[PDB]
């Protein structure tokens, strides 16, 4: 099955932490990532993009120590810094095990899909969220998924959250189709 293939592809991309961690939940996070279209996963593998699962704070990792005390873009006024943020995506991907669900230090529909969508946007699709095509779709529908002061202002964030809705499960996929039809069709064609 395609999901099995995607899980095999992910076995070459996911990095598990050393020490004690929740192995069952880490597997659950991988299983949810396996719903992403294989074309994107294969491209992540080809670019040697690693999806790092973490048992501690992001900024405890050497490569993110420079973000200690830094307030993420769009997080102004939350009183939180990258030290408190459970996931990160872009040129890399890093995710705290156990914080997948909405409300676990974030309000994304799913942490690992949102973060990985950033890496797909930036690495695989050469920042398509900044393209003129997407900006026109973002201008119309970017305030239709809630969190309008964040998703409605940053097209890369609207892309990542829409991507997460599309691939998390059938319920969120349907919700995106109803709320953001042009975005839905855009993602549908993106995978062709």
């Amino acid at each position: 099955t395609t999901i099995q293939q995607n899980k095999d592809t992910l076995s070459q991309i996911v990095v598990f932490p050393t020490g004690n961690y929740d192995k069952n939940e880490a597997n659950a996070m991988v299983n949810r990532l396996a719903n992403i279209d294989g074309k994107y996963l294969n491209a992540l593998k080809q670019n040697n993009l690693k999806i790092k699962l973490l048992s501690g704070k992001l900024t405890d990792e050497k490569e993110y120590a420079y973000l200690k005390g830094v307030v993420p873009k769009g997080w102004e006024g939350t009183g939180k810094t990258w030290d408190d943020v459970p996931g990160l995506g872009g040129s890399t991907v890093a995710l705290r095990i156990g914080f997948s669900n909405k409300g676990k230090g974030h309000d994304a529909i799913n942490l690992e899909l949102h973060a990985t969508a950033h890496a797909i946007d930036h690495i695989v699709l050469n920042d398509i969220s900044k393209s003129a095509q997407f900006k026109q779709i973002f201008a119309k529908e970017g305030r239709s998924l809630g969190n309008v002061n964040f998703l409605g202002v940053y097209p890369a964030e609207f892309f990542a959250e829409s991507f997460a809705y599309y691939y998390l499960n059938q319920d969120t996929n349907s919700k995106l189709k109803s709320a953001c039809p042009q975005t839905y069709s855009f993602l549908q064609n993106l995978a062709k």
Binding site: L67, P72, K73, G74, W75, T78, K80, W82, V85, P86, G87, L88, G89, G90, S91, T92, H106, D107, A108, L111, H114, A115, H118, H122, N147, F150, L151, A156, E157, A160, E161
Partner: peptide, 7 residues
């Protein structure tokens, strides 16, 4: 580049 989740 780095991007956070939804606050």
């Amino acid at each position: 580049e780095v991007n956070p989740p939804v606050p």
